[PDB]
């Protein structure tokens, strides 16, 4: 048979395609089909259940909210206007899944089992440092165009959902992308700890759009550069050149992006609007303080001077560097910033005068909403604390996303280690056992 | 006789296509006919408490236990 047990074992079947470019193409074309299929098929599933007059986060949605962010079918405050863009994006993908799926199935069971001969342009050689650097170069451009495909939707075709909208959350057209490298790349030099949050600290659409402009170019630039080159010297005396080794490198890459994504959806307020997803972890703990400082203040309590059990400040206290923040266990989230809460902040943090008479109703109910929709829930979807009662069936989209992606991100890091460990033994050549005859260890002096 | 052979013999299925669903439909009826509830003294959704009472029918003494249990069924529990 073209490929059977005298290749690899059954459960390692797909490794039998390591050297059949053609068929190995069907896989990638058939697979890429499953992703479009899902994206498409799921969107329609979401929409089929979607209830306009009800929070998205209260409906187990995770795609419609992705579209909403790009400014589609929504308006003032994340209000859903037209469900058409959703239905569209959904069906379109679903269709393209059939097109791709066709090609996949075709290239894997009819077309050429190898490519090198049925066209030397597409056929390839793993150790062919140039073909590799080049195909990589092609893809580095396709991805680059994509990065601009966003910059376009935002600057020309409609905008994106800006929750920080001056008049209050709303679809806004970005016509002033931050292009200043000093700022853009500044983010990469930002600490990943409390406060300075690195990439996840992005907090306005200009930088988002601006930064994507830079990536699109920088990306396509490298796409051409690889098309027009070969790895230098070190680049060659450093890496392993093989089918597995290349995989591994891309495995460790996704893993890392998987962890970064987990933190983005968990912490970021901007590119993940609390209006479509739920309120952030810190955002919800903040809202409780808001809610009760607001309540009790109406009962005649002077929030500014209230002393709590420990003598720290029931409602307001100070952070380690002097700024006025909310008190209680919520002292850990004093780095939370959000449309609803900002108008209360002064140059020194929460201003006792604004808190004292500028709190607006929409804020009181925002704080209440977010307080009662914190990202706490159970596997069987029972919103709240582990000791809560059944009734409110809910688990924040931010919790779902974050966990799923930490698991995937993780296992992929194992995947990395595994495929990289195999590649290094494969190269030097011992990934199948120690040479009974020449057993390396046996030629080394005894350390004893 | 090597399971493999048996799980493949048309005789087998000819026998079990009858036997298996047989056993299934039986147990089903065991529950659906309310018989199981009596075989195991297990309360029906409407038999944990008497209408008003909110107390539990806790057996409180070993020897006169069975007797005590019977009385618990009395208060229409």
């Amino acid at each position: 048979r073209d490929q059977e047990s005298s290749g690899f074992a059954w459960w390692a079947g797909n490794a039998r395609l390591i050297n059949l470019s053609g068929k190995l193409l069907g896989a990638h074309v058939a697979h890429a089909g499953l992703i479009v299929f899902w994206a498409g098929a799921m969107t329609l599933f979401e929409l089929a259940h979607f209830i306009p007059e009800k929070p998205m986060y209260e409906q187990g949605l995770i795609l419609i909210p992705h579209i909403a962010t790009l400014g589609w079918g929504v308006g003032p405050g994340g209000e859903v206007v037209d469900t058409f863009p959703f239905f569209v994006v959904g069906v379109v993908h679903l269709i393209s899944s059939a097109v791709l799926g066709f090609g996949g199935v075709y290239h894997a069971i009819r077309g050429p089992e190898t490519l090198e001969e049925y066209s030397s342009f597409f056929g390839y050689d793993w150790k062919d440092k140039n073909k590799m650097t080049t195909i990589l170069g092609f893809h580095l451009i396709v991805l680059g165009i994509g990065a601009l495909l966003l910059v376009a939707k935002a600057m020309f075709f409609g905008g994106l959902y800006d929750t920080w909208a001056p008049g209050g959350g709303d679809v806004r057209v970005i016509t002033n992308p931050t292009l200043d490298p000093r700022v853009i790349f500044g983010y990469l030099l930002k600490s990943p700890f409390g406060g300075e949050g690195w990439i996840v600290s992005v907090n306005n659409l200009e930088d988002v759009v601006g930064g994507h402009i830079w990536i699109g170019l920088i990306c396509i630039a490298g796409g051409i550069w690889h098309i027009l080159t070969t790895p230098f010297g070190w680049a060659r005396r450093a890496f392993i050149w093989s089918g597995e080794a290349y995989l591994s490198y891309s495995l460790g890459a996704l893993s890392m992006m998987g962890f970064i994504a987990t933190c983005f959806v968990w912490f970021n307020n901007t590119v993940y609007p609390s209006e479509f997803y739920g309120p952030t972890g810190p955002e919800a703990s903040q809202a409780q303080a808001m809610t009760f400082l607001i309540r009790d203040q109406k009962l005649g309590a002077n929030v500014g001077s209230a002393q709590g059990p420990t003598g720290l400040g029931k409602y307001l206290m100070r952070s380690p560097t002097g700024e006025i923040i909310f008190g209680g266990e919520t002292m850990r989230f004093w780095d939370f910033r959000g449309p609803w809460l900002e108008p209360l902040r002064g140059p020194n943090g929460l201003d006792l005068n604004k808190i004292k008479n500028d709190i607006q109703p929409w804020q009181e109910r925002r704080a209440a909403e977010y307080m009662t929709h914190a990202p706490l829930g159970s596997l069987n979807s029972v919103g709240g604390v582990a000791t809560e009662i059944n009734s409110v069936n809910f688990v924040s989209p931010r919790s779902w996303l974050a966990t799923s992606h930490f698991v995937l991100a993780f296992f992929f890091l194992v995947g990395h280690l595994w495929h990289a460990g195999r590649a290094r033994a494969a190269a030097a050549g011992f990934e199948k056992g120690i040479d009974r005859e020449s057993e390396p260890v046996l030629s080394m002096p005894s350390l004893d | 006789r090597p399971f493999s052979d048996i799980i493949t013999s048309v005789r087998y299925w000819v026998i079990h296509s009858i036997t298996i669903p047989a056993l299934f439909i039986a147990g089903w009826l065991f529950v659906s006919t309310g018989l199981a509830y009596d075989v195991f003294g297990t309360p029906r959704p409407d038999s944990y408490y008497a209408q008003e009472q909110r107390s539990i029918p806790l057996v409180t003494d070993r020897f006169e236990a069975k007797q005590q249990v019977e009385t618990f069924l009395e208060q229409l529990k």
Partner: protein, 38 residues
């Protein structure tokens, strides 16, 4: 061994049988339970 005869009512049959019939008599009840309303 032997002109490959084999008896119908073997030995292991029992072992796999006392764990057989019951397994179904239950998985048949347990399903019918799902329809018990409040």
């Amino acid at each position: 061994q032997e002109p490959v005869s084999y008896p119908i009512f073997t030995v292991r049959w029992v072992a796999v049988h006392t764990l057989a019939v019951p397994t179904i008599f239950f998985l048949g009840a347990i399903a019918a339970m799902q329809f018990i309303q409040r």
